[PDB]
Amino acid sequence: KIPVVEYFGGKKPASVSATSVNIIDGNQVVYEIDSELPNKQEWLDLLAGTELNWLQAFISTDRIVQGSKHVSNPLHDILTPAKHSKVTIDKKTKKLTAFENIKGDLLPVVEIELVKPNTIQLSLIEH
Amino acid sequence: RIILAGTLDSNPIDDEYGFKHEIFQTSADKAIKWAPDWLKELRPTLVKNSEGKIYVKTKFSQLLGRAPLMVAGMTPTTVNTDIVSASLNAGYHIELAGGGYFSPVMMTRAIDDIVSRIKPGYGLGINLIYVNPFMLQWGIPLIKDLREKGYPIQSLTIGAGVPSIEVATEYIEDLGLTHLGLKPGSVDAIS
Amino acid sequence: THRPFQLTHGSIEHTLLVPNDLFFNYSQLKDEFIKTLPEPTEGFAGDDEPSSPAELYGKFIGFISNAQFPQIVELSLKDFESRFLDNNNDNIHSFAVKLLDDETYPTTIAKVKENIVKNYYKAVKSINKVESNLLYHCKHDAKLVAIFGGQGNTDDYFEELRELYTLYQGLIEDLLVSIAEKLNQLHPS
Amino acid sequence: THRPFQLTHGSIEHTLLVPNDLFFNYSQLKDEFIKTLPEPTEGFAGDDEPSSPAELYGKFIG
Structure with a gap:
């Protein structure tokens, strides 16, 4: 009967229903930002979701471990809301992909995936 | 929530008990003032992580990401790096006491040893004495420098007194800590 | 064919649309108002001096409640509800505490109290059933219970009864009269 | 059942008849108006400070 969670700690996962997210369902749920931007913390909480998983950890936690040093999470600054930006999150694999406008075309710039059972790959794409 | 149906007046400063207006209040949102139930709001529950380890779910345990048991900073006992590193490696919050340190160089050397000996990602708490101005004067800059350098100083504890609001907010905003520990000794310090 | 009818007390000023035919009644009632009103003072610290247009109009309603113009009192109450209670989303008590906070x-x-609640309940003749927020939450999640006190709470307890009588004559007159008659019957024993 | 609704900026003053039901909407919009309106000045020399009732009501519309 003990509740089972992936990890225990940090801020409790939050359910955020905000504007400028334009959530649409599918194989990868897509959040799209219009001209007006949402709150940064609300946007990050929405991307993290209500389920304690690896992506919830990798977005929600405000620190990462570089060797033996606690450094600020760069994912907050990377995923900060942007005008005309899209973000697709897979329901099953929990893979995140951030799309931004380049030369008038929507192209991916951030991929976050689980390559191995305990390794998270964050890939910054330059076109 | 107690509502005094016998008297009509503006709600108290703390909003602790209602007045006659609350019984007749009508609004589109239909919101009403509630009161907290400490038991159901603060039951010490249990949570199991994916690795099977079981923790006592609580506010403190959530904040620390660890069990709700800590070792408070002791000037003879927790000054030494061995006990601090051992407690952190065992997985319980502990405070390195600055009572047995007198220079930023000595304190930084001790923190370096602790960081090198603990597991990656394990924070460190630091305990300072408010009655001692010298230790704070050379320690607060040290904590700020170590934090902006990226050290795992997870928290700072102030014992033998509580700082004022203006010093406290400086500690919160400048040092970049996860949480600030304070040790009141009386209801005035609790206030 | 309405007309603008204004009542002022120092910086206080409330204007309402009133029927042209009944404007004469409104004017005479206004004159009697400013006769009974204490002289305006800076800050409106006078006990009977209104401090808001809502207070002034409530006092107008309270005055006209006793007159030969029940239609005046009814339409004035309707206008007060429309402007101030905002077509009855908040009760008069909620409006009172909102003003005390303003x-x-x-x-x-x-x-x-004197300038709004007493006058509103003097002029209102029928109260429609309203479901408060508290009573709404009672049906789903709120558990409402009642406690009645005893003696020793205050050394001038009768003042509360005088306040209740002054504020809500039209609401408890029958109960007070029946109880007083029973007490008159019993106490000679 | 209309009602008198007035907007002012110093000596500026424009009153309009409005439905009583929507008077609440007009009042809140007026409050937001006088929040966004600078402090009145003699001569109404402020660049966005209206100088006539027509200017004030046009700004209300805007």
């Missing part, structure tokens, strides 16, 4: 028109609890 800083633009500073007032006292006694001023708010």
Whole structure:
């Protein structure tokens, strides 16, 4: 009967229903930002979701471990809301992909995936 | 929530008990003032992580990401790096006491040893004495420098007194800590 | 064919649309108002001096409640509900505490009571069933219970009865009369 | 059942008849108006400060 969670700690996962997210369902749920931007913390909480998983950890936690040093999470600054930006999150694999406008075309710039059972790959794409 | 149906007046400063207006209040949102139930709001529950380890779910345990048991900073006992590193490696919050340190160089050397000996990602708490101005004067800059350098100083504890609001907010905003520990000794310090 | 009818007390000023035919009644009632009104003072600190247009119009309603113009009192009450209670989303008590909290028109609890609640319940003749927020939550999640006190709470307990009589004559007159008759019957024993 | 609704900026003053039901909407919009309106000045020399009732009501519309 003990509740089972992936990890225990940090801020409790939050359910955020905000504007400028334009959530649409599918194989990868897509959040799209219009001209007006949402709150940064609300946007990050929405991307993290209500389920304690690896992506919830990798977005929600405000620190990462570089060797033996606690450094600020760069994912907050990377995923900060942007005008005309899209973000697709897979329901099953929990893979995140951030799309931004380049030369008038929507192209991916951030991929976050689980390559191995305990390794998270964050890939910054330059076109 | 107690509502005094016998008297009509503006709600108290703390909003602790209602007045006659609350019984007749009508609004589109239909919101009403509630009161907290400490038991159901603060039951010490249990949570199991994916690795099977079981923790006592609580506010403190959530904040620390660890069990709700800590070792408070002791000037003879927790000054030494061995006990601090051992407690952190065992997985319980502990405070390195600055009572047995007198220079930023000595304190930084001790923190370096602790960081090198603990597991990656394990924070460190630091305990300072408010009655001692010298230790704070050379320690607060040290904590700020170590934090902006990226050290795992997870928290700072102030014992033998509580700082004022203006010093406290400086500690919160400048040092970049996860949480600030304070040790009141009386209801005035609790206030 | 309405007309603008204005009541003022110092900086206080409330204007309402009133029927042209009944404007004469409104004017005479206004004159009797400003006769009974204490002289305006800076800050409106006078106990009977209104501190807001809502207070002034409530006092107008309270005055006209006793007159040969029940249609005047009814339409004035309707206008007060429309402007101030905002077509009845908030009760008069909620409006009273909202004014006591409002800083633009500073007032006292006694001023708010006498100038709004007493007059509103003097002029209102029928109260429609309303489901409060508390009673709404009672049906789903709130558990409402009642406690009645005893003696020793206050050394001038009768003052509360006088306040209740003054504020709510039209609501408890029958109960008070019946109880007083029973007490008159019993106490000679 | 209309009602008198007035907007002012110093000596500026424009009153309009409005439905009583929507008077609440007009009042809140007026409050937001006088929040966004600078402090009145003699001569109404402020660049966005209206100088006539027509200017004030046009700004209300805007």
